Design a protein around this motif. Sequence first.
Motif, PDB file in Angstrom:
ATOM      1  N   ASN A  86       0.847  -1.184   0.000  1.00  0.00           N
ATOM      2  CA  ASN A  86       0.000   0.000   0.000  1.00  0.00           C
ATOM      3  C   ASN A  86       0.887   1.240   0.000  1.00  0.00           C
ATOM      4  OD1 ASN A  86       0.635   0.660   2.824  1.00  0.00           O
ATOM      5  ND2 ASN A  86      -0.735  -1.030   3.368  1.00  0.00           N
ATOM      6  N   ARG A  87       0.248   2.405  -0.107  1.00  0.00           N
ATOM      7  CA  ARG A  87       0.953   3.674  -0.237  1.00  0.00           C
ATOM      8  C   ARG A  87       1.426   4.240   1.094  1.00  0.00           C
ATOM      9  NH1 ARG A  87      -3.518   7.942   0.951  1.00  0.00           N
ATOM     10  NH2 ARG A  87      -5.309   6.584   0.514  1.00  0.00           N
ATOM     11  N   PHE A  88       1.008   3.661   2.213  1.00  0.00           N
ATOM     12  CA  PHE A  88       1.272   4.241   3.520  1.00  0.00           C
ATOM     13  C   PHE A  88       2.618   3.786   4.068  1.00  0.00           C
ATOM     14  CE2 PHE A  88      -3.293   3.394   3.036  1.00  0.00           C
ATOM     15  CZ  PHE A  88      -3.768   4.692   3.016  1.00  0.00           C
ATOM     16  N   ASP A 144       7.720   1.175   5.117  1.00  0.00           N
ATOM     17  CA  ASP A 144       6.684   0.998   4.105  1.00  0.00           C
ATOM     18  C   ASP A 144       6.064  -0.390   4.217  1.00  0.00           C
ATOM     19  OD1 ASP A 144       5.084   0.947   1.813  1.00  0.00           O
ATOM     20  OD2 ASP A 144       6.560   2.002   0.588  1.00  0.00           O
ATOM     21  N   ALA A 149       3.700  -0.822   7.274  1.00  0.00           N
ATOM     22  CA  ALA A 149       2.323  -0.394   7.049  1.00  0.00           C
ATOM     23  C   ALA A 149       1.509  -1.473   6.346  1.00  0.00           C
ATOM     24  CB  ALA A 149       2.299   0.903   6.243  1.00  0.00           C
ATOM     25  N   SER A 150       2.150  -2.280   5.498  1.00  0.00           N
ATOM     26  CA  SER A 150       1.471  -3.436   4.925  1.00  0.00           C
ATOM     27  C   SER A 150       1.107  -4.444   6.008  1.00  0.00           C
ATOM     28  CB  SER A 150       2.348  -4.086   3.853  1.00  0.00           C
ATOM     29  OG  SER A 150       2.329  -3.330   2.654  1.00  0.00           O
TER      30      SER A 150
END
Lengths: 302, 297
Positions: free
Chosen positions: B216-218, B258, B261-262
């Motif tokens: 994801n982008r987060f 990154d 966050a996944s």
Amino acid sequence: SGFRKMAFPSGKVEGCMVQVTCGTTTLNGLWLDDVVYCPRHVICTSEDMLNPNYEDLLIRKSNHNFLVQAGNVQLRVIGHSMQNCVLKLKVDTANPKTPKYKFVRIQPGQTFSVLACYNGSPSGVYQCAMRPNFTIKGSFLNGSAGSVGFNIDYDCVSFCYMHHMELPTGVHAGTDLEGNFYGPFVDRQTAQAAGTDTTITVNVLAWLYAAVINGDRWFLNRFTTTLNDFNLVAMKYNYEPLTQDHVDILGPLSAQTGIAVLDMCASLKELLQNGMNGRTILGSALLEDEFTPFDVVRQCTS
Amino acid sequence: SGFRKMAFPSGKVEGCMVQVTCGTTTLNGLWLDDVVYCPRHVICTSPNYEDLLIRKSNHNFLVQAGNVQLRVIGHSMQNCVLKLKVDTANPKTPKYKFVRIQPGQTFSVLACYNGSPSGVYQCAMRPNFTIKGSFLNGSAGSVGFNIDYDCVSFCYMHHMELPTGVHAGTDLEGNFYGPFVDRQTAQAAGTDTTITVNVLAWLYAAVINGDRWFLNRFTTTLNDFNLVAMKYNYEPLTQDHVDILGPLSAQTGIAVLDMCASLKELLQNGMNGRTILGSALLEDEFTPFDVVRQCTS
Ligand code: NA
């Protein structure tokens, strides 16, 4: 107790792995007595990988072009021959570590241990099942061709798989030790695809028995089914048919647990129609089908 | 391509496995040079071990290497393991050392019965210090090991099974992992947790193999992730864990926070009936080293 993917001890096979180099191509060979077995695509050159003529490439080659190394020792190739998709390299030295062995072509749904090898040196061992679509879900990188799969029965190593290639979906394809591919695949870099896979029903039942042996019993119930009635449900969910021989082979597990095979089929039927509803079996949220009844017996039974 | 629980080739260890017998009690031993290493409980007979060892004699010890009878020259205490000196050095003794592993580290186990190897599987030491393995009666003395450039680092010897079905043992120095003792005390394993850095490594392995629907982008801070991970019985992620994941972060081009966050998203929302590397659950028995060793790609 406990239950894990358990491979056979690999020592008897480790002593047979050698490196075979033809030009810029290096892969693994299986050195038994005075013969080295390896995939025939070792003779494949970059000139044609789409659809080479292996007969043409073999004729354009001599005994001295095959570099075979066993550890630090160079084996002298005395003769070479082609059997289907496997190359046979006769060498002047007989492998003193040759175990008792035989070549076997296994049926879909059967499992075996894979000794992953690179440059003739074993790297690791893991269990694999021959899928109904004749692929295996292995772990292989470039240079692992010629790694073998095997079972060990009373100190006899039954070789059943030699790795050749990886398909576009990431599954793997190979031959028996006579060079005959499992499935419709060919040893050429063409667009090939495996057919749709199905679930190995007898293996799922064996894994359910392993769960019960380990105290996982929530999926059991009082219901029983007939073989015919269950096999109708198995068809609906893309499961392999269950035969009477499958019932017989599960007998020892039924003896150990007290759960009749047709009783366990009723449990599997309910699992397929309701799912696990957020519960787990043997630490898994999916129905595992890469354990044969013999695999469960050898691991969970004295 | 592909990622599977892979054990190290067991051949170097197979040549060291022997059978040790005492009265009616029989288990496995490790034969390195002229020393056989076995669990101390074998001296105990259906516990003041020091007295029973004093009472024990050499001829009470029956050691068989296959069908080769090894003559016991003496016996000494090595914490909770027993060192049996024999008159013959093992000709198949490999290059080896004794290493005590940390929780979260993985190793291969050669399950043996009556001195004979049955199977090889890959196990990870748990944070509780228990190992979840596959052992039957008579498997005591089976060893765990890692192999690096034909050097065998022995890290585990199996002793007994705990009431919850998990297994407890010592290193090859006889020091037990965790607070467990080789007595009949009502010991039980502490609450186990998930090895966070191993799950992240396994997620990197999935990305290398093309399985990346969970990205994801987060990006999360380290502490924000740890507060969520604590809620789900995950071990805290340290800066050293972040550093260790550096190579996989570089190969995949995905920063560690990154990827965190996944993992946070997967913990809170589940998998929605999907799989990662063939599994519908999050796998924590693969170290970052295990990923680089197999997913070199
Ligand atoms: Na992200």
